[PDB]
């Protein structure tokens, strides 16, 4: 699957996608790939 190596992808038991980016150190509930 095509995914930039900076995008550390994790999924919450709530059924939510949640990002943790290694460069900016950011946590986003918004997935840019899902749209």
């Amino acid at each position: 699957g095509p995914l930039p190596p900076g995008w550390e992808v994790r999924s919450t038991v709530s059924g939510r996608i949640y990002f943790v980016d290694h460069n900016n150190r950011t946590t986003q509930f918004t997935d840019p790939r899902l749209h």
Partner: peptide
């Protein structure tokens, strides 16, 4: 976002 506060950025998240 409009969602609850996301999980604090831990470098390597194992859940």
């Amino acid at each position: 976002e409009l969602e609850s506060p996301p999980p604090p950025y831990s470098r390597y998240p194992m859940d």
